[PDB]
Design a protein around this ligand. Structure first.
Ligand SMILES: Nc1[nH]c(=O)nc2c1ncn2[C@@H]1O[C@H](COP(=O)(O)OP(=O)(O)OP(=O)(O)O)[C@@H](O)[C@H]1O
Ligand SMILES: [Mg+2]
Ligand SMILES: [Zn+2]
Lengths: 127, 41, 71, 1136, 584
DNA sequence: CTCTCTCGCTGACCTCTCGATG
RNA sequence: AUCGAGAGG
DNA sequence: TCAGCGAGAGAG
């Protein structure tokens, strides 16, 4: 069903199209009660159900409800394996360079322009 | 990095590529198999 | 068919096609339901297919002709 | 010679010929001696804790002392805690005594108990502090010109390097940083160009004098002191905040502060001796004179008036032991306290404050317990047999914190050096990636007060060898001429010959009688303890000797201990010094003995005033070692026997009447038998299995913890849903298995037995904290442990109480009060609580014991590097037999002898046949019940055979009962001793064979047990010592069809413990590609791993009888795609 | 779920490194957010901007600009770029190799009774390895209905499953593999025979291809599942298809050790042995005479022999005559296939002779007779090696009687050459070479004397007179047959050990004048350890070079396949003689 | 135009046991 | 799971 | 550590 593999640089629109949820500021799993934080690195809405065909709150627990988002939680009812698939994104508040395209033997982000690596590295590090 | 810069394609014509993807290698008892694919392209 | 398979190689032509012909013949007996052309002698389908190939009763053209006749 | 009581029961016959002038020392001195100079009081204050206190101490320090341990070693092992003592320190600000922490203590055998387990600290071999001059041989530059350099290494602080350049310019490096011109440092010491030229010049030649300093000044871009400091500051710390105060302070603290630099006493001594000074004492900080002298010496070496040093010379490396590392860690912990004390001394307060308020003991204890338990040199102790522990405690390592690395180490440091002679064994070393980096101490080796190895020699004066003994080190012995230990001497001590083979200056040659200075003490001076137990070692190749010495440490103890017929004479020393036996402290008479206790009544002339005078020895019974083996002690004395001091009262594992015994004596024939010993296979008889000669006991531990989780509380109970009534049969009312129950795989113990493992229950333990609740069995058993422990103590004290009461009744109130106080103290110590982990209520432990018998697939070996695997067990009527109808035990292949040149295994086989031959002649005499005179005559003739030996046993002083007891002990064969380089000759073996009425060729006629026909040639038959190694086929067979899988990569797990699968690696894929098997490769890559739908479809199809697969896509590729996308790179599959 | 949080037995959890770097980046980015709202001066802002780019560079590839961030321990954290590269990355650990089902492992012993296409498998392993097949065959016969009844029956180990298991392995091959797989002969296919015990039994004739031994070695076993896999195993990888090497032409299955010794012992001859001078009607009479005890295996006799030769059309033609031979050779003639000459066994056989016999049989007759011939050769060699009773003893290491005189003469020579140095007549660097040459010549003389005394020793009586013949010494026979020994090691056993070398590489001036029968002293033994340690270190520390070279060679040329039948081009190269025949 | 000389950057099979730390 | 230590082919 | 290679400044 396929015959080739393609590779290229990404763009903000493509990354936003990959994601199933917005930025995630909160941190963790709430060690006290193991249910994940809303809008976090582990989050039920952004990434998916924690259990098969069950809501986070628990209002819906039947296959007949499949394809229904929760009004009070915002969590869709689906197989939990989708947690291996869905991705997310973070909105940076300032542009940041990519270490791969800056540091290399044939530097790329500094070969389109004339200046060598030393002065450009000085500029990037606010000096 | 170089591949992402250039924007390359891979046609999967060797042994290692087919091993990694999980298909029949184009040699031995699988050789004839690949001959069919070219006939349909 | 047993211990050594050199007899069938000289008839089919090479080792890489003998495997495919034998597998195609054996799947007919195991799952499809067909009767051997040789005495069974308490053997597995692979060995029966190899014996039939060695005798001379099975090759690609015969299977193609039989499939055309069936349909 | 007068013989000891233990040694008069069975006397080994010695074949040695050179008299011994020095005794073998105590084999565990290196550990005990080192740890002694760490906790004992030293008024001069220069070794241990006193030095550390005096090195950092406002507050005034007065003294210190160590307390009394709460528990003892056995209770610590049972409970699972550390055996330590409290540290108390006296300070004045007011006088007060504070608490500093816990110091772990060393036991009587040189070990530590840390968390209920025994550990060993390994000694370290490292570079000595000082100054060293070296030069790379070549390949630094294409010009092929050598470059010279010098280095200074302290105990603490920073490094300092001087070096040259291809253009002959001096450069200096600090802490392996970027180069600078050398003269800058000179400018940093208040020197002008005139003064520098005055120092280094007086004239400039081109062969013996050099302008190197002037050219370096030319290249030097500096002319002022401050410029030098700012250049150094910029080089050391990039960022350039140049300040005058900042520049001075860095140079002041870099090499000239007592709190940041320390050149120790050994470093000072080596530094002074390298520069040909006079005094050997000084300060720990550098000076301008030292740096100038180093520069001059390097320049002189460049000119050609000196030589470089050998870095691998054993006079440049020294030994660091546990008592030094402990002090270092304690000082590191102590320096953190003073910062807090100084900080809290600046807040401002008085009167109400006390010294205890300013001392926090957490950092010190943290550092000490980190070192004792997490260091690389603190190791889980090896406890296979008595030899393993001795070998582990005498090890030297080149790795560690201030050491080397396995991968970065080259080829020269791994080699045998001429200075190793008599100090490090040149044989025993690991055969893997660690070859050359781990070493063993020699038999007589020591260390001096600085930490350098030394060895003893005999003084020679005016051509006669005397008994005066001196210890010399590697530096000292290079100035003398030393003779070998096999030189011949007459009764006056003169050299018989006019030319003697001697060593001098790293070479060996012949010298005259009057040019000799010293002489060796023994012929076993150059080997280690393990290599001195191989008979006929001088007929073996070095590789096979290494293999045999290594394999001798993997043997497993058997049900019955059996001494070797052929030995070397070092068995008693190892057995006694290991500490696995019981040795009498004082002489006396045996009063009571049973299977688990011995009581000795002390002689009158060895009693202190006001003492009852009895000694009680309790024995260890059926305890597991670190390797899941068995430890058991057995008495070897009878009732009413007399005992002297130092006599063996009980035997340990692998010990027979006080001698080390690792294997069994077997009758062997060298011949091929129908292909059942093809490569290295071994054919064994059924009589060996029937007699249980290689049966071993293994003990295993299992634990069960009930969690204190808040969600659901859990407790131990008999009720279990969905189980039969028969299942609860072995369980009591409280749900815990009975003692003595025979369980098998898949049985409930505490609810559990791992699959395939059986055994018997021999021990159950219950652990509880200071919490709440208890169970009926724990009330029955956990309270039973305490009551039984109290009963044993009461029984032990009762004997002394009765003795004192009988003595008095012939002031009872004082004695009664004292004994009641002792009983109350014992009860209080036994009734204390246990500190568990949070979230845990109680723990239950169960011990199982299983027996293992030999079967095809087990590994066997001898002492000469010959190993193999059992292939077949043969019925007795198939084995070859002789003219009397006696079969053999083992059949071995002769084709394995001539290629591997270990001829010794043949020689032993000839001698063992002789030894047994003596015993037979005794055995018959005991069956016919002859008179003591004939036995006396025959045994005396047996002990006198030899060619000028040194033993000289005389039986005319023996009692009749003593002669009878000796003959009874000698009826299975006469033991024989042959030292490593002074042993028996072929002629002596043939004389012993002739005395035993046996052929002198060692070969007889054999018959085929299946047909009765005679083989066409005579065969070699004899006796040889065999070992059973800890590689059992019961622990290696494994198989799997389906099971559990990982989480991220949905592939099978690995390891027999968790029921894993085998790995199909890259090379196997290459092999399948070279065959052309595409379908097998695809089947292995997808449907047996990573294909979630394909695996299920294949399983269902196989169950339904259809052998076909439907492959899909592996999950690891999807994981890789997502991972690459997470880096901000777009990768995808092109369907079109 | 690709960076999960794993619970523990205790309340605490174990986390990955990625969840820490994400939190660091998130916190720092949010810290930048507050400063913009509060309108802080740009001096404070410029510091924080440098901070964020420092965090991101840690998450992508830690350590490109050295600022490595650690965690609870003092160990660098692992970034995203660390999970796809290196020896432990996804490519080299999960995609080019992995773990599989239906596999097992165990220790290997020897089975001397097997046929070339068979192996011995424990039934405890076999029961687990073939579980679904047994479940299916149980459900087929109605002995169980649900999927749990069959599992219970197998767990209880009833007496009916031991016949199902025998039926479901009758013609199903298995794959055996040994851990260092250097070429394609490291995996091979066999047919199982169920045995009792826990060890795997391996054919003696396939060891050399595996580089296998019986000292503690281990092996792994795999099971093919589909029909195509079974046919591939039977037709490509079965051990009866792999008899010639793919790197050259010579065969790979060759007898060694016991077999060579047995055949060599049968085919020798003696003088004035029992039964010498008879005339026999054929090999069967010779076997009768040997078994009855009326003749020796080494007696020289006359026997009537019939042999066959192929004609131009390929038919076999017979020829009968009388020949001078021995009893053992006539006995051995009965296992040789038809179409080979009698002269191929009328001599004393060694390793090379047996290998040549096998190659000639393959060249003339074909593949199927060769397997039978090899198995019969192995059986006969094992059978007749045991009957001889060959052993080894200390009296077999014979030392020449003239060693003392040669050594004394050499010592006198080297002592006399020092007089030319005490009073200046030779270079201080010239006596070294002279001493070395003297000692080398003495070593050669001693070795020659020893080998001349060992090889021939008969002093035998032939019908009255005295005669000489080849010896029957055990060590000499072992070395001459080509079984294990070498002429260089007999020198160390019974001659002189020779000259040693210093660790740098220079030659020590005086040699070792003692062999291994008469032991060494302390100085000689100490000198001999330098080379031993040097060789062991060399063996240990340079397997990685070969591994790396092999990996590079495989990677450079892994995609070259024969994809055409005739190129049509006329070019070539010209080959010159190494013989010409072996090169074209 | 063209040899010298610093200075980084990437590379070096399979299996088993123990403890301490997450 | 990671780290450290040891062992076998 | 050690071996190997390319990128970058020098002094003509
Ligand atoms: N570090 C290592 N790397 C590797 O890749 N393979 C190794 C290995 N170490 C051992 N082997 C394998 O083991 C065989 C020799 O070890 P060994 O069983 O003792 O037989 P050996 O011929 O030495 O004769 P013996 O000692 O019995 O006298 C050797 O070829 C090899 O396959
Ligand atoms: Mg091996
Ligand atoms: Zn909900």
């Amino acid at each position: 069903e396929f015959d080739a593999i393609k590779i290229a640089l990404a763009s903000p629109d493509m990354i936003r199209s990959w994601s199933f949820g917005e930025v995630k500021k909160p941190e963790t799993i709430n060690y006290r009660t193991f249910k994940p934080e809303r809008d976090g690195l582990f989050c039920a809405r952004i990434f998916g159900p924690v259990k098969d065909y069950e809501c986070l709150c628990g209002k819906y627990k039947r296959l007949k409800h499949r394809g229904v988002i929760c009004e009070k939680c915002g969590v869709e009812v689906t197989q939990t394996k989708v947690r291996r698939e869905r991705m997310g994104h973070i909105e940076l508040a300032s542009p940041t360079a990519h270490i791969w395209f800056l540091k290399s033997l044939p530097s790329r982000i500094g070969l389109l322009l004339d200046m060598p690596l030393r002065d450009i590295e000085r500029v990037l590090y606010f000096e | 990095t170089e591949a992402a810069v250039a924007g390359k394609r891979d046609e999967l014509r060797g042994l290692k590529e087919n091993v990694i993807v999980g298909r029949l290698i184009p040699a031995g008892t699988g050789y004839a198999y690949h001959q069919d694919r070219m006939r349909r392209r | 068919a047993r211990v050594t398979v050199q007899d069938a190689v000289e008839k089919i032509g090479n080792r890489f096609d003998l495997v495919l012909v034998a597998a195609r013949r054996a799947r007919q007996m195991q799952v499809g339901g067909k009767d051997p052309l040789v005495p069974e002698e308490n053997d597995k389908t692979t060995v029966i297919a190899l014996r039939e190939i060695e005798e001379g009763l099975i090759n690609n053209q015969i299977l193609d002709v039989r499939e055309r006749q069936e349909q | 010679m007068v013989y000891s009581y233990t040694e008069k029961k069975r006397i080994r016959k010695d074949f040695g010929k050179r008299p011994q002038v020095l005794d073998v020392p105590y084999l565990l001195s290196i550990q005990l001696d080192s740890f002694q100079k760490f906790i004992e009081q030293d008024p001069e204050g220069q070794y241990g804790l006193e030095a550390a206190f005096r090195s950092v101490f406002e507050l005034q320090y007065v003294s210190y002392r160590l307390g009394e341990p709460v528990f003892d070693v056995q209770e610590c092992q049972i409970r699972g805690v550390t055996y330590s003592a409290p540290l108390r320190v006296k300070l004045r600000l007011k006088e007060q005594e504070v608490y500093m922490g816990e110091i772990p203590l060393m036991t009587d055998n040189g070990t530590f108990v840390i968390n209920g387990t025994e550990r060993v600290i390994v000694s370290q071999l490292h570079r000595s502090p000082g100054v060293f001059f070296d030069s790379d041989k070549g390949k630094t530059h294409s010009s092929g010109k050598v470059l010279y350099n010098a280095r200074i290494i302290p105990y603490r602080g920073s490094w300092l390097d001087f070096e040259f350049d291809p253009k002959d310019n001096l450069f200096v490096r600090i802490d392996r940083r970027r180069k600078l011109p050398a003269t800058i440092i000179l400018r940093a010491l208040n020197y002008t160009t005139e003064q520098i030229l005055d120092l280094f010049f007086e004239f400039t030649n081109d062969l013996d004098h050099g302008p190197y300093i002037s050219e370096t000044l030319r290249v030097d871009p500096t002319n002022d002191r401050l410029s030098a400091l700012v250049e150094i500051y910029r080089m050391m710390r990039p960022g350039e905040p140049p300040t005058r105060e900042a520049a001075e302070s860095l140079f002041e603290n870099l090499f000239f502060s007592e709190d940041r630099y320390d050149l120790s006493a050994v470093g000072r001594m080596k530094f002074n001796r390298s520069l040909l000074r006079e005094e050997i004492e000084g300060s720990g900080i550098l000076s301008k004179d030292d740096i100038i002298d180093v520069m001059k010496k390097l320049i002189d070496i460049r000119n050609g008036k000196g030589e470089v040093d050998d870095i691998d010379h054993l006079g440049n490396r020294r030994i660091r032991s546990v008592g030094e590392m402990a002090e270092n860690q304690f000082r590191v912990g102590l320096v953190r306290v003073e910062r807090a004390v100084k900080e809290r001394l600046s807040l401002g307060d008085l009167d109400t404050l006390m010294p205890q308020d300013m001392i926090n003991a957490k950092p010190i204890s943290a550092a000490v317990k980190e070192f004792f338990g997490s260091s690389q040199l603190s190791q889980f102790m090896d406890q296979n047999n008595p030899l393993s522990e001795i070998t582990h405690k005498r090890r030297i390592s080149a790795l560690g914190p201030g050491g080397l690395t396995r991968e970065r180490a080259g080829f020269e440091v791994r080699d045998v050096h001429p200075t190793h002679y008599g100090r490090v064994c040149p044989i025993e070393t690991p055969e893997g990636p660690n070859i050359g980096l781990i070493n063993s101490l020699s038999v007589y080796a020591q260390t001096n007060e600085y930490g350098f190895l030394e060895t003893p020699y005999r003084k020679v004066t005016d051509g006669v060898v005397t008994d005066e003994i001196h210890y010399l080190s590697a530096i000292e012995e290079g100035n003398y001429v030393i003779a070998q230990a096999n030189s011949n001497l007459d009764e006056e001590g003169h050299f018989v010959e006019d030319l003697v083979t001697c060593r001098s200056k790293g070479e060996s040659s012949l010298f005259s009688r009057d040019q000799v200075d010293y002489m060796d003490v023994s012929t076993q001076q150059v080997v280690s303890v393990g290599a001195s137990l191989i008979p006929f070692l001088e007929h073996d190749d070095a590789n096979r000797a290494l293999m045999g010495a290594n394999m001798q440490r993997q043997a497993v103890p058997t049900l019955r201990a059996d001494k070797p017929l052929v030995g070397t004479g070092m068995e008693r020393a190892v057995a006694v010094d290991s500490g696995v036996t019981a040795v009498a402290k004082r002489g006396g008479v045996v009063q009571y003995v049973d299977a688990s206790r011995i009581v000795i009544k002390v002689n009158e002339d060895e009693m202190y005033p006001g003492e009852a005078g009895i000694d009680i020895y309790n024995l260890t019974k059926y305890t597991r070692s670190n390797q899941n083996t068995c430890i058991n002690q057995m008495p070897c004395v009878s009732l009413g026997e007399p005992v002297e001091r130092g006599d063996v009262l009980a035997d340990g594992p692998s010990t027979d009447l006080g001698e080390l015994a690792l294997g069994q004596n077997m009758r062997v024939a060298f011949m091929p038998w129908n292909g059942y010993n093809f490569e290295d296979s071994i054919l064994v008889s059924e009589r060996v299995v029937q007699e249980d000669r290689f049966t071993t006991i293994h003990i295993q531990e299992l634990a069960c913890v009930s969690r204190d989780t808040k969600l659901g509380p859990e407790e131990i109970t008999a009720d279990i849903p969905n189980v039969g009534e028969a299942a609860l049969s072995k369980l009591d009312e409280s749900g815990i298995v009975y003692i003595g129950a025979e369980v098998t795989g898949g049985d409930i113990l505490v609810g559990r037995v791992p699959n395939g493992v059986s055994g018997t229950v021999i021990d159950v333990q219950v652990f509880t904290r200071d919490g709440v609740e208890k169970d009926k069995r724990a009330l029955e058993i956990e309270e039973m442990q305490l009551k039984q422990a109290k009963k044993d103590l009461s029984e032990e004290l009762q004997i002394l109480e009765a003795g004192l009461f009988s003595r008095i009744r012939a002031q009872y109130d004082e004695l009664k009060h004292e004994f009641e106080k002792k009983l109350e103290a014992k009860r209080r110590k036994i009734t204390q609580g246990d500190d568990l982990a949070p979230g845990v209520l109680k723990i239950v432990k169960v011990y199982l014991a299983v027996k293992r018998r030999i079967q095809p697939g087990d590994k066997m070996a001898g002492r000469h590097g010959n190993k193999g695997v059992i292939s077949k067990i043969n019925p007795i009527e198939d084995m070859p037999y002789d003219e009397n109808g006696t079969p053999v035990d083992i059949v071995l292949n002769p084709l394995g002898v001539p290629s591997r040149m270990n001829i010794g295994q043949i020689l032993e086989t000839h001698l063992g046949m002789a030894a047994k031959g003596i015993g037979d002649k005794i055995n018959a005499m005991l069956k016919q019940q002859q008179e003591v005179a004939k036995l006396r005559e025959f045994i005396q003739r047996a002990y006198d055979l030899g060619a000028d030996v040194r033993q000289k046993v005389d039986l005319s002083t023996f009692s009749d009962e003593e002669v009878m007891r000796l003959a009874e002990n000698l009826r299975k064969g006469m033991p024989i001793a042959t030292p490593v380089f002074d042993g028996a000759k072929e002629a002596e073996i043939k004389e012993l064979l002739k005395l035993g009425d046996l052929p002198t060729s060692g070969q007889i006629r054999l018959y085929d047990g299946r047909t009765g026909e005679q083989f066409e040639r005579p065969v070699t038959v004899g006796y040889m010592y065999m070992l059973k190694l800890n590689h059992l086929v019961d622990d290696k067979m494994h198989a799997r069809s389906t099971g559990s899988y990982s989480l991220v990569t949905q592939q099978p797990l690995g390891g027999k413990a968790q029921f894993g699968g085998q790995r199909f690696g890259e090379m196997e894929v290459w092999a399948l590609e070279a065959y052309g098997a595409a379908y097998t490769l695809q089947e292995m890559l997808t449907v047996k791993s990573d294909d979630v739908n394909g695996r299920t479809k294949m399983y269902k199809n196989i169950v339904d009888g259809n052998h076909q697969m439907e492959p899909g896509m592996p999950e690891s590729f999807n994981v890789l795609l997502k991972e690459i996308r997470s880096l901000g790179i777009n990768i995808e599959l092109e369907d079109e | 779920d690709l960076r999960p949080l794993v619970p523990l037995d205790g309340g605490r959890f174990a986390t990955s490194d990625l969840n820490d770097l994400y939190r660091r980046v998130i916190n720092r980015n949010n810290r930048l957010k507050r400063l913009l709202d509060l309108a802080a001066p740009d001096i404070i802002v410029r510091n924080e901007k440098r901070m964020l780019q420092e965090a991101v560079d840690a998450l992508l590839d830690n350590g490109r600009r050295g600022r490595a961030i650690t965690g609870s321990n003092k160990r660098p954290l692992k970034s995203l770029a660390d999970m796809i590269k290196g020896k432990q990355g996804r490519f080299r650990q999960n995609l080019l190799g992995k773990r599989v089902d239906y596999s097992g492992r165990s220790v290997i012993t020897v089975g001397p009774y097997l046929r070339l296409h068979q192996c011995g498998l424990p039934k405890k392993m076999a029961l687990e390895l073939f579980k679904p097949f047994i479940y299916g065959k149980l459900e087929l016969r109605g002995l169980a209905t649900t999927i749990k009844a069959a599992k219970k029956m197998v767990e209880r180990e009833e007496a009916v499953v031991w016949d199902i298991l025998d039926e479901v392995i009758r013609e199903h091959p298995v794959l055996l593999n040994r851990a260092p797989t250097l070429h394609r002969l490291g995996i091979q296919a066999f047919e199982p025979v169920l045995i009792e015990g826990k060890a795997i039994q391996l054919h003696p004739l396939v060891c050399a291809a595996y580089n296998a031994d019986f000292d503690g070695d281990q092996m792994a076993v795999h099971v093919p599942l589909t029909l195509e896999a079974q046919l591939e195993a039977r037709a490509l990888m079965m051990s009866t298809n792999n008899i010639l090497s793919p790197a050259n032409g010579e065969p790979i299955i060759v007898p060694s050790q016991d077999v060579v010794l047995g055949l060599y012992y049968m085919t020798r001859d003696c003088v004035n042995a029992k039964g010498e001078g008879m005339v026999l009607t054929g090999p069967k009479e010779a076997e009768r005479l040997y078994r009855s005890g009326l003749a020796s295996l080494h007696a020289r006799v006359k026997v009537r022999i019939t042999e066959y030769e192929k004609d131009a059309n390929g038919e076999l033609v017979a020829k009968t005559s009388l020949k001078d031979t021995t009893v053992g050779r006539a006995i051995l003639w009965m296992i040789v296939p038809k179409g080979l000459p009698y002269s191929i066994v009328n001599q004393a056989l060694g390793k090379k002779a047996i290998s040549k016999m096998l190659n000639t049989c393959y060249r003339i007759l074909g593949l199927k007779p060769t397997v039978i011939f090899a198995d019969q050769i192995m059986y006969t060699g094992f059978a007749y090696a045991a009957r001889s009773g060959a052993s080894v003893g200390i009296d077999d290491m014979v030392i020449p009687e003239k060693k003392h005189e040669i050594i004394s003469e050499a010592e006198a020579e080297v002592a006399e050459i020092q007089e030319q140095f005490q009073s200046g007549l030779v270079t201080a660097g010239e006596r070294y070479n002279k001493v070395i040459d003297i000692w080398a010549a003495a070593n050669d003389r001693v070795s020659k004397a020893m080998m001349d005394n060992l090889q021939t020793e008969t002093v035998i009586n032939r019908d009255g007179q005295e005669e000489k013949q080849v010896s029957f010494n055990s060590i000499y026979m072992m070395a001459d047959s080509g079984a294990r020994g070498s002429a260089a090691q007999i020198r160390q056993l019974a001659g002189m050990r020779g000259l040693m070398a210093k660790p740098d590489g220079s030659i020590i001036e005086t040699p070792i004048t003692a062999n291994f029968r008469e032991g060494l002293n302390v100085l000689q033994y100490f000198i001999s350890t330098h080379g031993a340690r040097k060789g062991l270190a060399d063996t240990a520390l340079k397997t990685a070079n070969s591994g790396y070279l092999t990996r590079r060679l495989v990677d450079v040329a892994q995609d070259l396949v024969v994809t055409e039948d005739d190129c049509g081009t006329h070019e070539g190269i010209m080959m010159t003689p190494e013989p010409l025949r072996d090169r074209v």
